[PDB]
Amino acid sequence: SYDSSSIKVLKGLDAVRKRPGMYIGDTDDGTGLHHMVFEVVDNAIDEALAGHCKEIIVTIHADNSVSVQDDGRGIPTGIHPEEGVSAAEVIMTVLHAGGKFDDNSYKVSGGLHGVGVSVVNALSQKLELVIQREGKIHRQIYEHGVPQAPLAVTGETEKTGTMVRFWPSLETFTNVTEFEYEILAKRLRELSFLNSGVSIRLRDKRDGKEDHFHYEGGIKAFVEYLNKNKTPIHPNIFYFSTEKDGIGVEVALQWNDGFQENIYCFTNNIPQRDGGTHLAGFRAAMTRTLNAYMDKEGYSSATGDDAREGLIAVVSVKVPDPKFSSQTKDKLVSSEVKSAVEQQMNELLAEYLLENPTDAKIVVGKIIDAARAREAARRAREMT
Amino acid sequence: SYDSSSIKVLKGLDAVRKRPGMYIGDTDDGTGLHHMVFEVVDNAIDEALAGHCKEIIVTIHADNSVSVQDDGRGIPTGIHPEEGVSAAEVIMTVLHAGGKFDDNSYKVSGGLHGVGVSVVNALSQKLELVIQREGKIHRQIYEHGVPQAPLAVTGETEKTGTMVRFWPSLETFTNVTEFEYEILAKRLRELSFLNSGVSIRLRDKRDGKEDHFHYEGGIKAFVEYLNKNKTPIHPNIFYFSTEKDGIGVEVALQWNDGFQENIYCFTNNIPQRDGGTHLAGFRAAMTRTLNAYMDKEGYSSATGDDAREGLIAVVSVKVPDPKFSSQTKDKLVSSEVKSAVEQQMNELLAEYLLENPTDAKIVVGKIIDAARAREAARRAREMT
Ligand SMILES: Nc1ncnc2c1ncn2[C@@H]1O[C@H](COP(=O)(O)OP(=O)(O)NP(=O)(O)O)[C@@H](O)[C@H]1O
Ligand SMILES: Nc1ncnc2c1ncn2[C@@H]1O[C@H](COP(=O)(O)OP(=O)(O)NP(=O)(O)O)[C@@H](O)[C@H]1O
Ligand SMILES: [Cl-]
Ligand SMILES: [Cl-]
Ligand SMILES: [Mg+2]
Ligand SMILES: [Mg+2]
Ligand code: NA
Ligand code: NA
């Protein structure tokens, strides 16, 4: 019998536990498990983007929990009048709740859905929250998303910051249930490059391993790092950072003598594994600008794929209200970012090629060689 | 100042309008716009999967609205006691609400989040709902997700079904704002193949164009259709349908003399553009089973990619509670589906090759030729 009693409304965090895939991704291969950490880290990075956090400490504990401490402003603790509990508890227990729906608290933030840490909470057997704010230490414990007691003051402090420690629920996560140091370290190293001036520490209490990431030089240095064990073919890394029409665009790139393409795209410091409009704009400007240069200098018919071979690039955009296809933010679907990146790249890459004739000549050589190899592969295929 | 008044909770459907990308996808290139239709169509298909709907009519109206009529059971109309309004209104105005959180109303369904038609409503300037149920016609109008009046009886009927007509909000959708016949027709043709016995009609009132899709022969015929304007190299399409361990697995495939691979994956009739665990299991069993056959018959070192060239396949699984990474359901992230597909394929594909020696020999020839062409391309590349 199909009638009004067949219709169910899921309340609070029940939807997250019921359908974890739409909130955290794959709960079996480890990627969802580590995403729990990255949600908490993204909130600390957002305090760093806002200018308030200079140190982040990520700890893998020996009982398979993870903690993240930041020295930012602290999650607000005052009573939220509408809901009648502390703003921190609203944040931990209510979907689509937070301080990133306008630009008053965070001008630019990776966060935008009001869901992230509420997901972490919902999918954790236990979560510990410690907040340092307004001279006071506040603490609260959750079990499966349920607060055990109201947020309470436990003492005094000169400091500000937020600490979240969580133990993931094995009723949700299967197969890969332990944290992998190198997965966390990769992401934290990249965040250090993206956030100059912010100390990021990683500690593993299982084995005593630790890292301290504090690179200077930003994404230009990130490109150097990524070519470290490769062989760059030209010495001058192309780089710019601009802020035009409400949108920050920062690009670095360099070709090496290998045959792979590795472009890393980020929006408000969140990676897009599956690319998006920023990558589409980057590719479009590279193809245009190189073809124009080869035409003006008399070297020209290669395509956009021949520009790929040997490329390492980082594209990092800063956007007031970006649009992603999912909570995991694997893909950027904001059309005006395609145009901002394309426009800035066309102008600054053309200047780069004019100002660095030796590099330009080497890169043209590489593109031509890629095209020559592509055409020979094709003829060889046809002939078998 | 960052404090508890900085924390905002979005209510009702406000979150959908605020962050449409996580609910509908890209609101500028047309893909989100057409997804609005497919959400409504998916709900009618779910009535068809359940055995209650034999006809679906999709109409593109001349004012740029779309309607979908089905002859299923009808959206329940009785008052939902907890919320105090009709179950239909709860469905249209509340996220994570519906009848697909257990298997009592729909054994198997594409739907699972309780979000789809509430998203359509939230992002529509206007929505018209007409429900035929229990001898009565019920009607309600929404504007920007807001009901204008409570659901009302308007007359009598011998029929059952649901009709939804919506006008998409241009405050949300940009650039591609008109419906494209061929986008809808492609999806509806594929749903006809996936749902034998269900009449699917498409009508465009802008120009009088119409289609009636009612293919028989199912996914085996779908593979024939997809090779129609190509040249299959062997006459016998591989096909099976089984239901083992709670999971339905149905596969059809055939090689052609071209060089592209086109695998179409579906879970409860919803396509996965970005693949997933069903595709991973399909690839794994193909590689294993073909290598075993080539080893036993003495033809063997090709890889999994050489099995790709010329392949057309459809993989359709039926799963009680699948896991997707997003509301748009582009990717299946359920580990036990990888194993069900892999296991069923290994057993039935090996039988197929034994029972059809002429086809097996042709397919082995094709795999070998693909490998030969791959190796020649590689040597040619190296030498430039
Ligand atoms: N470490 C932190 N320091 C200060 N405020 C924080 C911190 N973590 C969370 N918050 C606050 O809690 C809110 C909710 O966080 P969260 O549930 O992650 O959603 P969000 O960051 O706003 N968006 P999203 O992560 O994309 O879902 C944030 O918007 C902040 O207002
Ligand atoms: N055409 C229909 N006929 C009968 N019942 C329907 C129909 N459309 C919607 N419903 C009911 O309305 C509920 C909510 O639909 P919807 O908001 O699309 O979510 P869902 O189909 O359950 N899941 P999802 O589409 O994955 O978000 C369904 O679960 C059904 O109970
Ligand atoms: Cl009812
Ligand atoms: Cl406060
Ligand atoms: Mg967040
Ligand atoms: Mg639905
Ligand atoms: Na914001
Ligand atoms: Na169900």
UniProtKB/Swiss-Prot annotation, chains A, B:
Changing H35A: 0.2% supercoiling activity, 7% DNA-dependent ATPase activity, binds ATP normally, complements the N4177 ts mutant. The active site is at E39 (proton acceptor (atpase activity)). It comes from the Bacteria. ATP binds at Y2, D70, G99, K100, Y106, L112, H113, G114, V115, G116, V117, Q327, T328, K329. It is found in: Cytoplasm. The record marks K329 as: Transition state stabilizer. Signal peptide: none annotated. Na(+) binds at K100, D102. Changing E39A: No supercoiling or DNA-dependent ATPase activity, 25% fluoroquinolone-induced DNA cleavage, 50% ATP-independent DNA relaxation, binds ATP normally, does not complement the N4177 ts mutant. Changing Y2 to F/S: 5- to 10-fold reduced dimerization of residues 2-393, fragment has 3- to 5-fold reduced ATPase activity. Fragment dimerizes upon crystallization. Changing K107 to E/V: Binds about 50% ATP analog, 2- to 3-fold decreased ATPase, retains ATP-independent DNA relaxation, quinolone-induced DNA cleavage and negative supercoiling activity. Changing G161V: Resistance to coumarin antibiotics, decreased ATPase and DNA supercoiling. Residues 1-217 are annotated as: ATPase domain. Residues 218-384 are annotated as: Transducer domain. DNA gyrase negatively supercoils closed circular double-stranded DNA in an ATP-dependent manner to maintain chromosomes in an underwound state. This makes better substrates for topoisomerase 4 (ParC and ParE) which is the main enzyme that unlinks newly replicated chromosomes in E.coli. Gyrase catalyzes the interconversion of other topological isomers of double-stranded DNA rings, including catenanes. Relaxes negatively supercoiled DNA in an ATP-independent manner. Consists of 3 domains; the ATPase domain (residues 1-220), the transducer domain (221-392) and the toprim domain (393-804). ATP-binding is cooperative, and both subunits must be wild-type at residue 103 for supercoiling to occur. Non-hydrolyzable ATP analogs (and ATP-binding) induce dimerization and enhance ATPase activity. ATP hydrolysis induces domain shifts that are probably part of the mechanism of DNA cleavage and rejoining. Belongs to the type II topoisomerase family. When the enzyme transiently cleaves DNA a phosphotyrosine bond is formed between GyrA and DNA in an ATP-independent manner. In the presence of quinolones this intermediate can be trapped and is used as an indicator of drug toxicity. This is DNA gyrase subunit B. The chain holds residues 4 to 392 of 804 of the full protein.
